[PDB]
Design a protein around this ligand. Structure first.
Ligand SMILES: [Ca+2]
Ligand SMILES: [Ca+2]
Ligand SMILES: [Ca+2]
Ligand SMILES: [Ca+2]
Ligand SMILES: [Cu+2]
Ligand SMILES: [Cu+2]
Lengths: 722, 719
């Protein structure tokens, strides 16, 4: 017996195209490009013939396929995109089995308390040296796979380490004064607590809300203010901001301004309510899903690769052109790109041991009650990998992308598969190079880039990260932001209203009674680059104008001031785009005797105003806790446990336990294992074009080979000589 | 009777694909996407059925089609990408007949001298108000077609104006002291003059060059150094840099350093030979055309639009989603994007009256003899539109692009049609917007951008310009640079050699004996934005940190310092990317009471280091002549004859006749017709990855609607 083709393929996620003139179906799914004609005893998969026992059957205009069609075709082997890993890469993320195993081990421990939650269950980093030896020399890692198990027992954090090979607990260590990140049940608890609070219901009522059951809460971390916010440093608290649900699918457009509840999560109660002036909730329906819009007409546009892809995915390793890298997922920071090498005429040269988002923050500038403590440290406090937003095929990623599924542990320690977690796609990116010599045949070649895209949504705002590998050796890192703006309820409807000026002192009036409060988007990428080896140095090249001392008519020249940056403190700096900053290997040179290096460009542009620093006075607590927000470039000595710019436990942190801490000892950066950190930010002043939903805005960063190679990297394989 | 399909189609410039499984041919050419089966009585053109008089026939495994095929299919009318223009827009460029006509009118004047050349023959446009009334109200411009005809009689410039309808000469004016741009015959004269110079051949011989017939010249303008360069101001001169042809198709890689010849184009002779230290010519073959290489096989990738394009081209008017604009070509600056409007829910609102490259310069920073006066003013001294480089289909532009031919007049006044002069193409640009609310169905829409791309090549370096229209109202303007770097021959083979440090004082050693001399790439775009109307004002919004005075724990807040920039001198400024600069219409506001505006971002990023200014001391002659290089934003009052940041006659200019002159008067910019100028540049410190050919490097600029609309512009019309 058989099934209906359209509905089944659609559910399966394939794109189905029917050409009535050619009597042909074109089916596409990830790396598979399939052609199949009704009645045919053969189908084509990536340009190769595939025998079909049961042909596609056309019945009264409906196509029907065998119940084994999806598998026979899409899992045939003619789609070579994915290959089986023979020898397991040491950096492969914990499998669902290993995650269950780690949880069983801690659950077996004597000190384990029922009720414990798991903030993070991830692979404990194997030693770097052995990992590269595995990647370059194929040498097995003889160290047992271990897992870091970070638990929250009520409000207490405990870090444990389990030996997976040997099935045993290695360490169990309580971490004094650390606060755990926000976990998913905290969202439900805050909503329930608020719903059962008699006093909150009364506060809401006086603010014009008739049906308290329509109140939507949103949990926010409270930060640290040395008690000026009046909050006990020892309680596990969350502040709660509320909106009214009016049924337009966008509660964010209906702020209940000046009403903040402080919830103690262990006690499950509201311990404080801050109330300021009553501002009538903006009630106009402002849907962003199109329910009230006309679906316009657009003709089809598809990017296709009929013979399959130029990249191969073996287990989690991706091979493409001269690039080789390992891609895995972490629950806190998302994708981890590792053991990145560039095959230079047969020799695989190291480029980056490990790269990933370090951490990020979206801090606000309004002093009002519902905003003063507002700051979203998205990855650290909320778990961006866990909150990954599955790619909407063909929209969040081009139609020629391949979408990968990724597995991580949820907060109860149960494996969770995130579908379409990361997109991989090659794309045309203009001419790689061109030279039209006058009177001669033109010379042009196309540029191809391989993009690794991941999206994560925390609350109202959606973040996109693209790791772009250019065939010429350059690596771009771009971050996109879209989503729904956090807005403030105001009485002005237009700038002609009496309260207009005061209502927009901290943000633009983007709609009647709604202000898009000013804030910054600050991203930080942690890049353990290893330029052609472990031992490198940080070098500065500042282009400058100097007096001409060579004679002739010119009064000046363009020269360069080159100097090494010897320690961490001098490497923590602002980045002037007019200058060049290189991570060089002083032990290896290119053909002209220049040290092989990579140019670090923390600021390659953006579509929103750029942040030059943190938009906070130096006496602000957020300023003192997060030093990473005020400098664009940081370079620190490699250490396996220094991975976050904001610190490992930033919820209610009292001091910098991140980049401020990692560079405080001011270690030497001369001919040593360096880790580059790039902070890139935006200062977002809003406008009406961004409401009810904000068009994606992007920021760009770049890493370019500098004298790493001896000539134009894409010219091609040399036809003559050795 | 029949003709071979592959052969006929390929000659036509269409792509031919055969699918043996579906027994289907897929034929593509610009906006035509055709499908045809051998023996079928019909074909499909952009999704619509077409009856064929003669079915394609498979003879000897080769397909054959009627001799009328191409016309019947590609010109059937089913490909609606191009539409007839029954009422020519007033900014349409001079047609081939008009250029022939303008030349005949100036040649009929008794003042016309034998051998006169034409540096520029272009439309002298109607007044702006009448052009806008044609675009928005279909009102005919009742002014006859006119052309500006700029002539070069030997070295003398004369500006003439001709009335094409009436067929008469309206004016003829010699331009005192102006030097004409470099014309194509000047390239051949320089090389010939060098070839016939006994003294030059002896200097070359001295420098190791065995065969002087292998010497390639390159003509360069000499600038102005108030006589310090020893050159007469009245003479028509060019400096000549030389290279050796070794047979690798890349003379640029074999500099003959420290040898410079000054040629007087009227006397037709070398008038000065400058000789510096002898440096053996870098001889190693360094081809960039692939003759010595084999590319890695790549699986096919195609971007298809089977039902045709979302844009329509009527004459030169392009319509795409909510945008409408006119695209035309100019021999000096290339493409002109005009009468740009945004259709906001059924009403066309003004955005930009005219936008185009203003001018550009690539100045060097070495003081030596063959470099100190080096500065290519690409469009103004060599004419970038004339030097347009035909788009290489599928490589210089994506495979789903439509390539337009454009016509201009050559230096002899003869119409010249440039094939594939401009690329037009739509491209997926990530999600337009997205919101995945926890536990709810996702919301994502794709972003589409329409790109207008043009490439021009002047000497060794290739310039790419992309005018990008975003569906949401933003306009991007990107500039890419590629080609062969100008290199200095040096003795050092590696940084371990004795002269290595001095040889690299002004540039990186990128190959043995070769240094890529440091220089800047500075582009300036002239943008006559008319934000929702002619009358606008320049407003600054500087985000600042201010002490909190509202109470609560915070010591500071994020606020904005807003203020108007009232006159041209204050508008001439550095651009801090952390600030906001708006061109606002103080007469119109959006739904919230905010003035409709466009946010100007002269610096939105780049892949090479960014130039913060001119890397020249303020007393350099190039600095003085071209003030546009040191400020990223300029706003001046609209004036029809102010179109070049470097001035109209920049060859050997003695002072700033461009933006320094246009803003000199420091006029008021309050509620008046403004023209924005964006200067964006790079400081290029070279690397080995850029030799022998440089991977394209880009810079980005942006114009974004700011309270121009009342909500997300891409949500759609309300049901
Ligand atoms: Ca490192
Ligand atoms: Ca350290
Ligand atoms: Ca204007
Ligand atoms: Ca003026
Ligand atoms: Cu924002
Ligand atoms: Cu350059």
């Amino acid at each position: 017996h058989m099934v209906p083709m359209d509905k089944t393929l659609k559910e399966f996620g394939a794109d189905v195209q029917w050409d009535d003139y050619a009597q042909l179906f074109t089916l596409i799914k990830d790396g598979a490009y399939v052609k199949v004609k009704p009645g045919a005893q053969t189908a084509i998969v990536n340009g190769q013939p595939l025998a079909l026992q049961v042909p596609v059957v056309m019945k009264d205009n409906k196509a029907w396929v065998s119940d084994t069609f999806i598998n026979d075709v899409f899992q045939s082997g003619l789609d070579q995109t994915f290959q089986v890993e023979k020898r397991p890469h040491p950096l492969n993320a914990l499998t669902a089995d290993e995650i269950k195993q780690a949880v069983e081990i801690v659950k077996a421990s004597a000190d384990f308390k029922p009720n414990t939650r798991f903030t993070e269950i991830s692979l404990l980093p194997p030693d770097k040296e052995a990992v590269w030896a595995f990647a370059l020399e194929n040498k097995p890692v003889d160290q047992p796979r271990k897992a870091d198990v970070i638990m929250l027992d009520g409000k207490h954090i405990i870090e444990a380490v389990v030996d997976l090979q040997n099935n045993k607990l290695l360490s169990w260590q309580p971490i004094k004064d650390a606060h755990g990140m926000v976990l998913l049940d905290d969202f439900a608890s805050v909503q329930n607590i608020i719903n059962n609070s008699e006093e909150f219901a009364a506060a809401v009522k006086k603010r014009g809300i008739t049906d308290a059951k329509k109140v939507i809460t949103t949990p926010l971390t409270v930060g640290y203010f040395d008690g000026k916010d009046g909050l006990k440093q020892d309680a596990r608290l969350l502040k709660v901001i509320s909106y009214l649900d009016v049924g337009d699918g966008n509660y964010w457009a209906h702020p209940i301004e000046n009403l903040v509840a402080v919830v103690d999560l262990e006690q499950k109660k509201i311990v404080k309510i801050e109330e300021g002036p009553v501002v009538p909730v903006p009630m106009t329906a402002r849907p962003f899903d199109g329910r009230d819009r006309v679906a316009p007409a657009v003709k089809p546009m598809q990017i296709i690769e009929p013979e399959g892809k130029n990249y191969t995915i073996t287990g989690d390793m991706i091979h493409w052109r001269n690039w080789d890298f390992h891609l895995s997922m972490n629950s806190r920071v998302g994708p981890m790109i590792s053991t990145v090498t560039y095959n230079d005429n047969g020799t695989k040269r190291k480029v980056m041991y490990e790269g990933s988002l370090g951490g990020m923050i979206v801090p606000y500038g309004d002093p009002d009650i519902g905003w003063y403590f507002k700051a979203y440290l998205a990855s650290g406090d909320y778990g961006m990998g866990t909150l990954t937003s599955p790619i909407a095929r063909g929209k969040d990623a081009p139609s020629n992308a391949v979408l990968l599924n990724e597995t991580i542990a949820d907060y109860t320690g149960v494996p969770m598969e995130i579908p379409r977690a990361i997109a991989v796609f090659e794309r045309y990116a203009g001419p790689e190079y061109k030279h039209q010599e006058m009177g001669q045949p033109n010379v042009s070649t196309e540029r191809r880039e391989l993009v690794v895209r991941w999206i994560s949504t925390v609350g109202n705002y959606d973040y996109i990260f693209d790791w772009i590998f250019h065939e010429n050796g350059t690596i771009g890192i771009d971050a996109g932001a879209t989503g729904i703006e956090a807005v403030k309820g105001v009485k002005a409807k237009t700038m002609h209203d009496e309260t207009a000026k005061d209502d927009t002192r901290y943000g633009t009036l983007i709609d009647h009674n709604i202000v898009g409060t000013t804030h910054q988007h600050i991203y930080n990428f942690r890049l353990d680059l290893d330029v052609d080896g472990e031992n490198n140095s940080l070098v500065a090249m500042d282009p400058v104008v100097k007096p001409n001392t060579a004679g002739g008519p010119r009064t000046s020249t363009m020269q360069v001031n080159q100097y090494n940056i010897g320690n961490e403190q001098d490497a923590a700096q602002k980045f002037d785009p007019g200058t060049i900053r290189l991570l060089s290997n002083p032990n290896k040179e290119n053909r002209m005797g220049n040290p092989v290096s990579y140019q670090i460009i923390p600021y390659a542009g953006g579509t929103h105003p750029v942040a030059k620093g943190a938009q906070f006075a130096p006496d602000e607590w957020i300023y003192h806790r997060l030093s990473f927000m005020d400098k664009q470039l940081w370079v620190t000595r490699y250490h396996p446990g220094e991975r976050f710019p904001e610190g490992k436990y930033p919820n209610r942190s009292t001091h910098d336990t991140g980049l401020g801490q990692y560079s405080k000892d001011n270690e030497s950066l001369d001919n040593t294992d360096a880790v580059v950190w790039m902070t890139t930010g935006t200062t977002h002043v809003a406008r009406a074009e961004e409401w009810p939903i904000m068009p994606t805005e992007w920021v760009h960063t770049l890493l370019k080979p500098w004298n790493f190679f001896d000539e134009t990297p894409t010219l091609g394989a040399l036809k003559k000589d050795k």
